Write a protein that binds this ligand. Structure first.
Ligand code: NAG
Ligand code: NAG
Ligand code: AN5
Ligand code: AN5
Ligand code: AN4
Ligand code: AN4
Lengths: 210, 212, 211, 212, 211
């Protein structure tokens, strides 16, 4: 009865936000995405092509007024899960991938009654890295920047919560140990366009384990 | 003729369950769900010590139960269950937590739904995950482990469960390159710094060595 | 004229799928016989570092639904047609010991005849569990893989073979591996847990390095 | 003027697709002639450990349907148009001895002309069964692969070649293998599957390693 | 206010996509000019065993349609919008000597501007026919690959470059190969068979092993 209600309520909530009622951010309605990285593994550094492969996940966070509901209208539901395909999601792309990104996790996001969204895709990424000096104590340094591919800083702004990449889940028996890992926001201009584009540069210092 | 009668019943039941109500939204804290997991290990195919990746083929038995999938067989010609495509129904988002490649489905994706509302789903899969196979060529063998759990639901929404903690090795390829010394599956609760909700996984530990 | 036969087809095809209720698959009450047969074209690869062997073959499948029947006279003497394999029901026949997902090498089109039978012959490359030790000896290597329904018992889908000899008439003459024998044997088994028989077809292949 | 030329095409295409019975394919009552021709671009790779060879080539397919005829005058003198291959019926021409799925290198777009003829030219990378022995000799290696309909017999699809010579006028001049000769020839054949004969176009390629 | 912009952009796309039948593509009578430009990011791999070289670049494509024009005054001063590439017409620009299907590295969203212009910048990994002989010398290797429409001629689609100098400003400083020169050149092709011309852009890159 009451469970059939919660189920009934939640079914209703979704139907109101999705099926009854977002073309993306505009310059009069810009959006801020908070990015954060949890590096899990450096699986492979290839010195013959200069490609390194990382497994990691990407915390993405944003807020949309058109996803706001009063819990009192809906049996006091505070949040729900939904297929990422049921909502709009940012096009956060790596700028120096050498291969299509591979998805290791379900495409499900959590929507909270204030309109805030959290999406945490796990992925394997091949990207441009010269791993020379990885077999030394100084290690090798590599970098890759992530941003929206089609939206300028007038439509999508990026930010971090910490400038420190989360290394708490890093694979303890990886071939590569992590010396340091930062995530830093940047504003850049490219020659196609007059407008700034925003990225978050992920810099990693790593070396062989011993 | 009587056969055409029983198809009618099954058709009628499947259209009643699937086309009648807005489909199940997934579990909530008000309406939690217990999912039982079990692993049957077929083969360790590859152990790469240059990247520290290992590849498993296995069956992942998932069963759970919904009150929206219940029916009285007295109203549907004594039908007690049916096979259906896994895309027709809600399924749990049980994910490996330390995979390195996308998981490859080796089998059809067909569930069995029973009149009490229980669903059983057993996909066969190839998984690559993080495994330092150091010790595999020794007699004491190598030991790797991988956790499985919901990717987006906490312990307040999805509770995991096992029926046993012993992993089924009765179908393990007899001529695998690796023999299995032991395989276990064990439920675990952990809290995380970000969040006061508890979180639940089934850690799958495997010891193996080069078969010789 | 030829335009009418064109039109009876999209009627016949409308009558069968769109208009009627969907086939829910076989039941214990309405079992289905599926006839299975393999044409082996090539053993492409045998990897003794992972114990995986790669085969390329065609798999002939045949079954019959009363729900796919029509009177030719009622549709302009159309006795059969072609249709996309996804527009109809197909049996969930699977290799039980593959290591990679099957790769389809042929179009997914079946032929449906007026008596209600279906023929469907996908070409595939399969990687399955096989120790090739002895493949470089005169006596060779032996590998075996079973096929059968993943979720249907013998009381719902009855597997069958026309013959227990695999067709080697299209086997690649200049392959790396020479075929000594290739059988496809039907097996029926019972399990203490369960009241129904479980059927599968065991593809057993004896082969060696050619020369 | 541009809106005008645009309106005629949108109208021409709409009459053909949206307002008409789709063509289901050839019958014995209404057989179809598909014509094939190959343009070999490259032999990328020859693997003598598996006996697989990799080719890059585009395959010219043409056929004619009354279903697709139109008077150019009723349509602003439009004599042809380009359209997505999914909007129309295409033949199921298949390599008979591929060892991998075919990889498509070009847009899936065909050209339709007012007499109803259709020209579809897909570029492909094919892996197929080929023993490259003798490729390091002056006489070279020889391989062969048949292309034909997978589900239609020689009474439903009649396969032809405008010519027996494969077009080698775009063959990569700095390829690892030079072509000694390449033919495309219609054969008729039987299969145990089915009572009726099937038609294919056999592509026999003769090639060796390039040396200066 | 922000709800208005959302609504304004929605009505715009509604009026642009639904009032009229999508652009059916260019014709002899309504030809389109497409501008191309390459930003070469990295030569990742030069295989001398297969003579294939792998590039990663992004390819700027630009065109203008009268049917994508609007007055920003009528639409909340929206000067441009982002939209999925499946919602509009895009050109079939293909690499003519690819050995592998192109791998897409960027989202497939275009930017439509109020004057009717479209900018679409797909980032790709391309494998193509190239003899890397000389890459370990001082003179280096040279490779070439043409880009153009697969199905249109110069009568329907014309190509253009803004410059003939490939943008090397995002080239990977620690790549295995250093770029000696990179050009992008519009070319016209005349064939005995055919009155229509054919336009391509010819990407020529000179490079060598980095020291
Ligand atoms: C179920 O089977 C029992 C025993 O054969 C029979 O009496 C009963 O009528 C059946 N009920 C239905 C609804 O078919
Ligand atoms: C409209 O938006 C454009 C684009 O940024 C801006 O430059 C211009 O000033 C705006 N016009 C008005 C009247 O605000
Ligand atoms: N009964 C539904 C799933 C069964 C899947 C399975 O483990 C299996 C394995 C081997 C043969 N048949 C079935
Ligand atoms: N209809 C297909 C034309 C494309 C073939 C082509 O232009 C070509 C020819 C030679 C080298 N590179 C490309
Ligand atoms: C518009 C359309 N597609 C890509 C971009 C760009 N985005 C990222 C790099 C700068 C150029 C802009
Ligand atoms: C019917 C269905 N599927 C494939 C075929 C055949 N076509 C190719 C090989 C010969 C038989 C017939």
């Amino acid at each position: 009865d009451d469970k059939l209600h919660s189920q009934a309520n939640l079914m209703r909530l979704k139907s109101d936000l999705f099926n009854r009622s977002y073309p993306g951010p505009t310059k009069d309605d810009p959006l801020t995405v908070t990015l954060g990285f949890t590096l899990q593994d450096i699986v492979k550094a290839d010195s013959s092509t200069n490609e390194v492969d990382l497994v990691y996940y990407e915390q993405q966070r944003w807020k949309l007024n058109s996803l706001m509901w009063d819990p009192n209208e809906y049996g006091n539901i505070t949040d729900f899960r939904t297929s990422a395909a049921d909502i709009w999601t940012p096009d956060i792309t790596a700028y120096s991938s050498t291969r299509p990104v591979q998805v290791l996790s379900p495409q499900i996001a959590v929507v909270t009654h204030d309109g805030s969204v959290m999406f945490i895709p796990a992925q394997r990424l091949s990207f441009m890295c010269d791993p020379t000096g990885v077999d030394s104590e100084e290690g090798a340094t590599c970098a890759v920047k992530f941003g929206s591919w089609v939206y300028s800083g007038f439509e999508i702004d990026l930010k971090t919560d910490t400038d420190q990449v989360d290394l708490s889940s890093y694979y303890a028996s990886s071939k590569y140990e992590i010396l340091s890992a930062t995530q830093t926001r940047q504003v850049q201009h490219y020659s196609c366009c007059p407008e700034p584009y925003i990225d978050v540069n992920l810099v990693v210092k790593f070396r062989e384990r011993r």
